[PDB]
Amino acid sequence: MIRFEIHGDNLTITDAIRNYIEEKIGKLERYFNDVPNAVAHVKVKTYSNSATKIEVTIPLKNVTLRAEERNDDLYAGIDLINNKLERQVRKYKTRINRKSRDRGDQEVFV
Protein backbone atom coordinates (compact mmCIF):
# COMPACT_ATOMS: atom_id res chain seq x y z
CA MET A 1 0.00 0.00 0.00
CA ILE A 2 1.27 3.44 -0.95
CA ARG A 3 1.81 5.27 2.32
CA PHE A 4 2.08 8.89 3.26
CA GLU A 5 4.02 9.53 6.44
CA ILE A 6 3.95 13.21 7.07
CA HIS A 7 5.05 15.25 10.04
CA GLY A 8 3.57 18.58 9.36
CA ASP A 9 3.99 21.38 11.87
CA ASN A 10 2.05 24.08 10.05
CA LEU A 11 -1.15 26.06 10.58
CA THR A 12 -3.55 23.68 8.87
CA ILE A 13 -2.68 20.39 10.55
CA THR A 14 -5.77 18.37 9.71
CA ASP A 15 -7.30 15.75 7.42
CA ALA A 16 -7.50 18.42 4.71
CA ILE A 17 -3.86 18.22 3.69
CA ARG A 18 -3.48 14.60 4.58
CA ASN A 19 -6.33 13.91 2.21
CA TYR A 20 -4.85 16.50 -0.20
CA ILE A 21 -1.64 14.48 -0.23
CA GLU A 22 -3.53 11.31 -0.35
CA GLU A 23 -5.08 12.61 -3.54
CA LYS A 24 -1.75 13.81 -4.89
CA ILE A 25 0.29 10.71 -4.07
CA GLY A 26 -2.77 8.65 -4.90
CA LYS A 27 -3.01 10.19 -8.35
CA LEU A 28 0.71 9.96 -8.86
CA GLU A 29 0.96 6.31 -7.89
CA ARG A 30 -2.24 5.54 -9.80
CA TYR A 31 -0.20 6.40 -12.89
CA PHE A 32 1.39 3.08 -12.06
CA ASN A 33 -0.14 -0.21 -11.15
CA ASP A 34 2.97 -2.22 -10.37
CA VAL A 35 3.66 -0.04 -7.35
CA PRO A 36 3.15 -1.94 -4.06
CA ASN A 37 5.15 0.52 -1.94
CA ALA A 38 5.44 4.28 -2.35
CA VAL A 39 5.85 6.59 0.66
CA ALA A 40 5.71 10.33 1.38
CA HIS A 41 7.83 11.15 4.43
CA VAL A 42 7.11 14.85 4.47
CA LYS A 43 7.58 17.51 7.06
CA VAL A 44 6.33 21.03 6.85
CA LYS A 45 7.17 23.62 9.47
CA THR A 46 5.53 27.03 9.66
CA TYR A 47 3.65 29.31 12.01
CA SER A 48 2.67 31.90 9.42
CA ASN A 49 0.63 31.85 6.21
CA SER A 50 3.52 33.74 4.61
CA ALA A 51 5.87 30.90 5.44
CA THR A 52 6.57 27.33 4.86
CA LYS A 53 9.51 25.09 5.61
CA ILE A 54 9.19 21.69 4.07
CA GLU A 55 11.02 18.51 3.59
CA VAL A 56 9.64 15.75 1.49
CA THR A 57 11.02 12.35 1.13
CA ILE A 58 8.90 10.12 -1.00
CA PRO A 59 10.38 6.56 -1.35
CA LEU A 60 8.86 4.79 -4.33
CA LYS A 61 10.16 1.45 -5.56
CA ASN A 62 12.07 3.15 -8.25
CA VAL A 63 13.33 6.35 -6.65
CA THR A 64 13.03 8.26 -3.38
CA LEU A 65 12.42 12.00 -3.82
CA ARG A 66 13.46 14.39 -1.20
CA ALA A 67 12.83 18.10 -1.14
CA GLU A 68 13.95 20.23 1.76
CA GLU A 69 13.39 23.97 1.43
CA ARG A 70 11.94 27.04 3.10
CA ASN A 71 9.41 28.42 0.63
CA ASP A 72 6.24 30.52 1.11
CA ASP A 73 4.00 27.79 -0.28
CA LEU A 74 4.12 24.40 1.11
CA TYR A 75 2.29 23.30 -1.90
CA ALA A 76 5.04 24.80 -3.99
CA GLY A 77 7.59 22.89 -2.03
CA ILE A 78 5.70 19.67 -2.42
CA ASP A 79 5.10 20.78 -6.10
CA LEU A 80 8.80 21.27 -6.32
CA ILE A 81 9.10 17.69 -5.24
CA ASN A 82 5.93 16.49 -7.06
CA ASN A 83 6.74 18.17 -10.30
CA LYS A 84 10.36 17.14 -9.94
CA LEU A 85 8.79 13.80 -9.00
CA GLU A 86 7.33 13.57 -12.44
CA ARG A 87 10.70 14.80 -13.76
CA GLN A 88 12.88 12.53 -11.63
CA VAL A 89 10.58 9.61 -11.50
CA ARG A 90 10.45 9.59 -15.28
CA LYS A 91 14.16 10.35 -15.55
CA TYR A 92 14.97 7.48 -13.24
CA LYS A 93 12.45 4.85 -14.39
CA THR A 94 12.86 5.68 -18.06
CA ARG A 95 16.68 5.74 -17.75
CA ILE A 96 16.79 2.50 -15.74
CA ASN A 97 14.36 1.02 -18.26
CA ARG A 98 16.34 2.16 -21.30
CA LYS A 99 19.68 0.96 -19.85
CA SER A 100 19.07 -2.30 -21.70
CA ARG A 101 18.73 -0.72 -25.15
CA ASP A 102 20.76 2.47 -24.70
CA ARG A 103 24.22 1.06 -24.08
CA GLY A 104 26.19 4.20 -24.82
CA ASP A 105 24.53 6.88 -22.73
CA GLN A 106 27.14 6.50 -20.00
CA GLU A 107 29.41 4.35 -22.14
CA VAL A 108 31.84 5.60 -24.79
CA PHE A 109 32.20 2.06 -26.12
CA VAL A 110 35.71 1.24 -24.96
Cα separation of 9 and 51, whole Å?
12
Instruction: Write down the experimental method used for this entry.
Output: NMR
| Residues 72/76/80/86 CA torsion (nearest 10 deg) | 180
Q: Which structural domain range is residue 92 located in?
A: 1-110
Q: How many domains does the chain have?
A: 1
Sequence letter at residue 21: I
**Dihedral sign, CA of 30, 78, 68, 19?**
negative
